[PDB]
């Protein structure tokens, strides 16, 4: 049969809040990191542990941002989070000016 | 007035189509305003007694 759209979503939320491993693929993140750092300094090296620490901080930051954004959407009474939600979120956090 | 020109061309489209097919789906059948529907060129040759 067909699962009514949105019924697997909650299941996935339940899984991914149960799970705790990192959710971005390790090498692609690492390469994005090396790229960004190259812009600041050439011939840089990273400890693997340092890259994993960056990924941890980045993911946990993003998770908290998504949480806040979701709350904004709910305040919009929207199930669907939107860029305007992220903007409002960060704005209230005072990240973006 | 770009407003009205739209309606003018819509009505021209109605007349020209009804010249060759009176029996459009949904569109009002062209008529001699006293009742009788207009025999389009399609109707002149459409079926039996074409």
């Amino acid at each position: 049969h067909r699962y009514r759209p949105g019924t697997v979503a909650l299941r996935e939320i339940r899984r991914y809040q149960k799970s705790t491993e990192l959710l971005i693929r390790k090498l692609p993140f690492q390469r994005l990191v090396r790229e960004i750092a190259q812009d600041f300094k050439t011939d840089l090296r990273f400890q693997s542990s340092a890259v994993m620490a960056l990924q941890e901080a980045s993911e946990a930051y993003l998770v908290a941002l998504f949480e806040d954004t979701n709350l904004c959407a709910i305040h919009a009474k929207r199930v669907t989070i939107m860029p305007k939600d992220i903007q409002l979120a960060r704005r209230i956090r005072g990240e973006r000016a | 007035a770009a407003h009205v020109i739209a309606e003018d061309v819509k009505l021209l489209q109605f007349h020209v189509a009804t010249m060759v097919d009176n029996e459009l789906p949904g569109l009002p059948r062209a008529m001699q305003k006293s009742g009788r529907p207009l025999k389009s060129l399609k109707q002149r040759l459409k079926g039996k007694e074409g």
């Binding site: 941890e56 954004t69 989070i81 | -």
Partner: protein, 78 residues
């Protein structure tokens, strides 16, 4: 590179974040915000690395950058 943060990866994260329904526009927004984030963090980390005269960015450099940013991370030494 940036697109290496795949749509499924961002979905997975937002699901961990409890997001039920996602506008596709969220993916590029997430990439942009994550880029800005990394930018700042890495800039601070390299600035420690530069001060240490190192070429290797260490885990401690990242920790100290996050400690500055108000993002204190446990797991790699304090």
């Amino acid at each position: 590179n940036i697109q290496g943060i795949t749509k499924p990866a961002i979905r997975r994260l937002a699901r961990r974040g409890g997001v039920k329904r996602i506008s596709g526009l969220i993916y590029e927004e997430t990439r942009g915000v994550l880029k800005v984030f990394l930018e700042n963090v890495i800039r601070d980390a390299v600035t420690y690395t530069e001060h240490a005269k190192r070429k290797t960015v260490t885990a401690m450099d990242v920790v100290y950058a996050l400690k500055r940013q108000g993002r204190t991370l446990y797991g790699f030494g304090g």
